[PDB]
Amino acid sequence: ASAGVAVTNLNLKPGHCVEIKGSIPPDCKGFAVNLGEDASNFLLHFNARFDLHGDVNKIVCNSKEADAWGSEQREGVFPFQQGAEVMVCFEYQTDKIIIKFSSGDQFSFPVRKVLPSIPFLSLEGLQFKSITTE
Amino acid sequence: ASAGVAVTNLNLKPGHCVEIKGSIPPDCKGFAVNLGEDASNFLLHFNARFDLHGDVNKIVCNSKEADAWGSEQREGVFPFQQGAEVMVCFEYQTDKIIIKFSSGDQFSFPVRKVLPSIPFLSLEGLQFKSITTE
Ligand SMILES: CC(=O)N[C@@H]1[C@@H](O)[C@H](O[C@@H]2O[C@H](CO)[C@H](O)[C@H](O)[C@H]2O)[C@@H](CO)O[C@@H]1O
Ligand SMILES: CC(=O)N[C@@H]1[C@@H](O)[C@H](O[C@@H]2O[C@H](CO)[C@H](O)[C@H](O)[C@H]2O)[C@@H](CO)O[C@@H]1O
């Protein structure tokens, strides 16, 4: 809303990727990028937390099924700074989604539901600059 | 009707613009780019008609309020070719929307309802590559 674009009919199929460019509000405790079927089912919820729910400078990744959050996965890397810009790429593969940052860092997250395509994308706490898929 | 990628909470403000990049299918009768508040209320409906509604290689712009279309503005320039990629920018000013083409072609359409920001964007018949805001 404030910072929360939603893309529908994304049509992201295996072997393709979507890159997001945004800027992080100074008053932001964290931002999230969600990839899924709709607002209640996320294949991937990528949440960079600066100071949120007890996590300080930690990336929490999870899936959501029918509004019930899955098994969280946490990552050590955190190449973000408030007020700075952000460039993340998500590469969708049938067996995993690989997240890459402009910083050169990368990690993978398991695909818990093989979908023919990912129709929905939404951002939270991120001021949208550009979205592009290949 | 829209049918293609849709973006909500785009919230394009006066003085800013969106750049849309995509591919025109090789058998495209026409395509459209919509900016408004929702699917039934458009500040601008930009329809490039290759062979559609009796029009051949025509650009027809109009607004829509509660599903009722307003008065059409027709343009003489048609800088598009089927099967090719399009790059079109929309600058939002309070008195008008300037429509710019990569080909340098440019024209404006009047703002018939001044909104503090445009929250919705939708594509029709165009294969999406990137959406960028400035
Ligand atoms: C250590 C731990 O278990 N922490 C969790 C929180 O992460 C969790 O917060 C939600 O987490 C999901 C992702 O799994 C979304 O980020 C959501 O926005 C968060 O509120 C809460 C609630 O499930 O439980 C523990 O605190
Ligand atoms: C010559 C003429 O008046 N033609 C119009 C059509 O343009 C019009 O088609 C609709 O046009 C709006 C744009 O103003 C949208 O593109 C819509 O999708 C079209 O169906 C029709 C119907 O309103 O009216 C005349 O035929």
Side-chain angles (χ1 to χ4, degrees):
Chain A
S2 40
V5 156
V7 184
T8 56
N9 285 342
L10 173 63
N11 185 213
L12 179 61
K13 312 172 84 70
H16 291 264
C17 62
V18 56
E19 166 194 277
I20 304 298
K21 276 176 190 168
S23 45
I24 312 162
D27 304 83
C28 135
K29 316 211 288 184
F31 73 82
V33 175
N34 305 294
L35 282 178
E37 289 165 282
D38 48 78
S40 283
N41 295 273
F42 299 149
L43 198 56
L44 169 61
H45 160 80
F46 172 92
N47 190 193
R49 293 167 188 196
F50 292 109
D51 192 335
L52 190 58
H53 306 112
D55 285 272
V56 179
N57 296 342
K58 272 183 280 179
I59 292 175
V60 181
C61 281
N62 205 353
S63 56
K64 199 177 62 168
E65 174 162 56
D67 276 318
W69 287 116
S71 299
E72 277 175 2
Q73 179 176 104
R74 291 193 159 56
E75 296 296 326
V77 181
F78 191 97
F80 310 119
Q81 180 182 15
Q82 279 163 309
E85 196 146 73
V86 153
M87 183 158 80
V88 201
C89 299
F90 299 87
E91 195 194 305
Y92 179 36
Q93 281 170 55
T94 46
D95 62 311
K96 61 189 170 291
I97 293 188
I98 120 96
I99 304 84
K100 301 198 196 63
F101 308 104
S102 62
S103 64
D105 298 279
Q106 105 184 22
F107 68 86
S108 68
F109 183 75
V111 164
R112 326 226 249 228
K113 176 74 172 149
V114 208
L115 299 172
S117 72
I118 298 177
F120 175 101
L121 174 140
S122 68
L123 310 180
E124 275 143 38
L126 193 56
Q127 184 188 189
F128 160 73
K129 200 276 152 177
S130 72
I131 172 174
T132 137
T133 58
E134 299 184 27
Chain B
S2 156
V5 128
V7 185
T8 56
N9 290 297
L10 165 69
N11 291 120
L12 182 72
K13 288 179 194 163
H16 299 94
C17 75
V18 223
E19 172 195 276
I20 300 287
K21 198 178 306 197
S23 296
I24 294 176
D27 57 338
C28 197
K29 279 170 128 293
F31 65 88
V33 174
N34 311 119
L35 293 207
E37 300 152 78
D38 56 67
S40 297
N41 299 289
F42 298 160
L43 197 140
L44 168 72
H45 157 89
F46 173 90
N47 196 189
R49 301 185 180 178
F50 283 109
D51 185 14
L52 195 60
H53 312 306
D55 287 299
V56 174
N57 291 195
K58 279 292 160 319
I59 290 181
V60 184
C61 290
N62 204 352
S63 56
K64 192 171 77 193
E65 178 188 328
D67 290 296
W69 293 105
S71 299
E72 293 179 352
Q73 178 183 286
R74 281 150 176 274
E75 289 304 323
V77 318
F78 197 75
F80 314 106
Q81 64 239 15
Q82 284 155 320
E85 111 142 292
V86 202
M87 302 139 286
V88 49
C89 319
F90 301 92
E91 184 181 354
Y92 175 46
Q93 251 64 36
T94 47
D95 56 294
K96 55 181 178 176
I97 306 265
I98 291 80
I99 296 103
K100 311 173 179 295
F101 300 121
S102 60
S103 39
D105 302 299
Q106 175 180 130
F107 72 81
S108 74
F109 175 82
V111 169
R112 298 166 175 164
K113 179 180 180 179
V114 200
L115 303 176
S117 71
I118 309 179
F120 176 90
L121 179 138
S122 68
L123 306 191
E124 312 192 39
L126 196 63
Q127 309 178 308
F128 150 91
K129 279 140 156 279
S130 54
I131 293 175
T132 311
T133 326
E134 266 207 295

